[PDB]
Paper text:
Echovirus 30 ([name]), one serotype of the species EV-B, has emerged as one of the leading etiological agents of aseptic meningitis and caused extensive seasonal and periodical outbreaks throughout Europe, Asia and South America in recent years. Furthermore, [name] is reportedly associated with other diseases like viral encephalitis, acute flaccid paralysis, hepatitis, and even acute diarrhea. As with many other EV-Bs, [name] is believed to utilize two types of receptors to gain entry into host cells: CD55 for viral attachment; and FcRn for viral uncoating. Neutralizing antibodies could possibly target different steps of viral infection, including blocking viral attachment to the cellular receptor, interfering with viral uncoating via over-stabilizing or destabilizing the virus and physically damaging and/or aggregating the virus.
The [name] Fab fragment binds to the [name] viral surface within the pentameric building blocks at a site near the fivefold axis. Five [name] Fab molecules attach to the north rim of the canyon that constructs the “star-shaped” protrusions surrounding the mesa [see coordinated submission by Wang et al.15]. The epitope recognized by [name] contains 11 residues, primarily locating in the [name] BC loop (E82, K83, V84, D86, E87, D89, Y91), [name] DE loop (T130), [name] EF loop (K156, E159), and the [name] HI loop (T229). Tight bindings between the antibodies and [name] are chiefly due to extensive hydrophilic interactions, including hydrogen bonds and salt bridges.
Residue numbers in the entry:
A (entry chain H): 1 to 130, 135 to 216
B (entry chain L): 1 to 213
The structure:
């Protein structure tokens, strides 16, 4: 089987050269076309270019030229797809399609958000009402800058009615939601908490939910 | 001039009906590829060389289409035929490829619940005012939402997030949420939401005031 997946890259300070590392080793070595598929959060699938290992011929496309190089090294069997002189529009999921009659062998992909930002910690605010059989719960997140965030409810014991809401953008700050439904026999009987985490700022915020 | 995509945007079909796709191309080709790109996960291969096969695609999937028009027809929709399908064509000046065809298994249309939440003490001490009304478990996708406070409408700071498709209920759940500041909350009293939906005639409306604690 073509092992294993692609690598990860985080936000890099502007001016340095980041580098992806696409680690498909399913040899088949080394005569194929490693075409890199890139897709925005606008759900459109675009093409970043391909590379050929037997002689060394790369390619490019009009919306990603100058200077996205696709270097090849058959000793390590990796394909490099990072673009320098970048802007913030390169914040998109970056796949790795191998060559067949179609685009059959993809990778798993990585999203690389690049800017000159500041990593902000999250802050759990209690969403609790101040009557009926079941009440929906939740705790709002407001103002975390990089897209790594964590979603838990009771650390793996009340993950039934957790709806995963997107962090749509306003004022350059991500705002998602995580609402869970509780029955009246456990509220306010057991102490419910929500614990979110930010890997990029390495900050943990917790809050216990109280009836107001 | 010049973009190429699949012609119908968002489809919907109950398990048992005909699902026929339609791709439009800016330039002619000979072979056409078709995929099954689920949400969050990497795409797979579904139909290549306009008809042939895949690794795990069943025998009911059929496809054709030559020139600038392609068509991948599902014979009968099952529980595993709900994916965003895109097409492709290798080139020699790529067109480029299309967007993807989102489609949802149809069922009985359900009326939501609208849960408005009052902001607690800790938010106003930090200095925030975020009033929500979570629309949960509705069908279909479309709701023309309205935020009106104290008689007149309000559309500034209104944010809308869409939790993706569920597997046990097979419905959608929204977060209708506007954001204000701590001084704009103490001048308005009744915070409410109307969910205009095609199931119920009147939108369900809940009311609460600020002078009670």
């Amino acid at each position: 089987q073509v092992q294993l997946q692609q690598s990860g890259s985080e936000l890099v300070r502007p001016g340095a050269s980041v580098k992806l590392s696409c680690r498909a080793s399913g040899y088949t070595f080394t005569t194929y076309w490693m075409h890199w598929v890139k897709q925005r959060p606008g759900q459109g699938l675009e093409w970043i270019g391909n590379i050929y290992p037997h002689s060394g011929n790369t390619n490019y496309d009009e919306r990603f030229k100058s200077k996205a190089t696709l270097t090849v090294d058959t000793s390590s069997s990796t394909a490099y797809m990072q673009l320098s002189s970048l802007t913030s529009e390169d914040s998109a999921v970056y796949y790795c399609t191998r060559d067949l009659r179609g685009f059959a062998y993809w990778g798993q992909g990585t999203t690389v958000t690049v800017s000159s930002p500041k990593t902000t910690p999250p802050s759990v605010y209690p969403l609790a009402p101040a009557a009926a059989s079941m009440v929906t719960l939740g705790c709002l997140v407001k103002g975390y800058f990089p897209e790594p965030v964590t979603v838990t409810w009771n650390s793996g014991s009340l993950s039934s009615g957790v709806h995963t809401f997107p962090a749509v953008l306003q004022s350059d700050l991500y705002t998602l939601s995580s609402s869970v439904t509780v029955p009246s026999s456990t509220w306010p009987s057991e102490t419910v908490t929500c614990n979110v985490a930010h890997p990029a700022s390495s900050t943990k915020v917790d809050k216990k939910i109280v009836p107001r | 001039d010049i973009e190429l995509t699949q012609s119908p945007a968002i489809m919907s079909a109950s398990p048992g009906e005909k699902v026929t796709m339609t791709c439009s191309a800016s330039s002619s080709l000979r072979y056409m590829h078709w995929y099954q790109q689920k949400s969050g996960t990497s795409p797979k291969r579904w139909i290549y060389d306009t008809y042939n096969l895949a690794s795990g695609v069943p025998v009911r999937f059929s496809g054709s289409g030559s020139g600038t028009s392609y068509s991948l027809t599902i014979s009968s929709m099952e529980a595993e035929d709900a994916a965003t399908y895109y097409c492709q064509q290798w080139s020699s000046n790529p067109p480029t490829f299309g967007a993807g065809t989102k489609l949802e298994l149809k069922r009985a249309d359900a009326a939501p619940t609208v849960s408005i939440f009052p902001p607690s003490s800790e938010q106003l001490t930090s200095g925030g005012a975020s009033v929500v009304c979570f629309l949960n478990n509705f069908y279909p996708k479309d709701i023309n939402v309205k935020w009106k406070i104290d008689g007149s409408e309000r559309q500034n700071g209104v944010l809308n997030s869409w939790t993706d498709q569920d597997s046990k209920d097979s419905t959608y759940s929204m977060s209708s949420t506007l954001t204000l500041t701590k001084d704009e909350y103490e001048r308005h009293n009744s915070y409410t939401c109307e969910a205009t939906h095609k199931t119920s005639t009147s939108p369900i409306v809940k009311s609460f005031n600020r002078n009670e604690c």
